[PDB]
């Protein structure tokens, strides 16, 4: 039993809700919140910009130190950093950005990072400003993640379409 509330159950382990991931994180304080990161951990917009703003830029300060020490992430890769006031940990995961021309096959590799954590609050990777089809992203999530994932979808119109079309 965990503290997530109001989710529709898609599969044994995948759940979905129309919610702002920022407000959901602030309420649940999950062990792991997933960020829709880029390789430079520059949290300027989309989910990343919103999560970082909610930390009063502390996520960005921590991220800049991480990059100065370790260099950029790989597309499809991840790193674990602090969750600040939102969660215990933030798993920064880099899905391919279609608006940069990156290989959508890397989306499965991106979701594989979730399997290192028993329970996660997460957005749909490569959706939104990353330019991929969110229906496809949900399919890859369901077919790749085996741990318990609670997906927050900000756009209500998109949420209804994802549910109505789910196989
Ligand atoms: O609906 C969706 C589906 C695609 C996803 C997204 C991911 C990265 C960049 C842009 C969009 N997205 N957006 C949010 N998903 C969850 N929580 C959110 N909070 C805010 Br603000 C936006 C937001």
UniProtKB/Swiss-Prot annotation:
Protein's cellular compartments: Host endoplasmic reticulum membrane
Reported regulation of activity: Inhibited in vitro by GRL-0617.
Catalytic activity: Thiol-dependent hydrolysis of ester, thioester, amide, peptide and isopeptide bonds formed by the C-terminal Gly of ubiquitin (a 76-residue protein attached to proteins as an intracellular targeting signal)
Membrane topology category: Multi-pass membrane protein
Domain of life (superkingdom): Viruses
Coiled coil regions in record: none
Domain Macro residue range list: 1-167
Subunit structure, as described in the record: May form homohexamers. Interacts with N protein.
Protein known as: Papain-like protease nsp3
Gene: rep
């Amino acid at each position: 039993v965990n503290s997530f509330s109001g989710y529709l159950k898609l599969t044994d382990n995948v759940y979905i809700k129309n919610a702002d991931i920022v407000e959901e994180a602030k309420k649940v304080k999950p062990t792991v919140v997933v960020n829709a990161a880029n390789v430079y951990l520059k949290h300027g917009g989309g989910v990343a910009g919103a999560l970082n703003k909610a930390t009063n830029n502390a996520m960005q300060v921590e991220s800049d130190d991480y990059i100065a020490t370790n260099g950029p992430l790989k597309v499809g890769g991840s790193c674990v950093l602090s969750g600040h006031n939102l969660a215990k940990h933030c798993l920064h995961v880099v899905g391919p950005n279609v608006n940069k021309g990156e290989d959508i096959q890397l989306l499965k590799s991106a979701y594989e990072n979730f399997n290192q954590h028993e329970v996660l609050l997460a957005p749909l990777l490569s959706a939104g400003i990353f330019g991929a089809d969110p229906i496809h992203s949900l399919r890859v999530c369901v077919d790749t993640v085996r741990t318990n994932v609670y997906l927050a979808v900000f756009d209500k119109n998109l949420y209804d379409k994802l549910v109505s079309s789910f196989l």
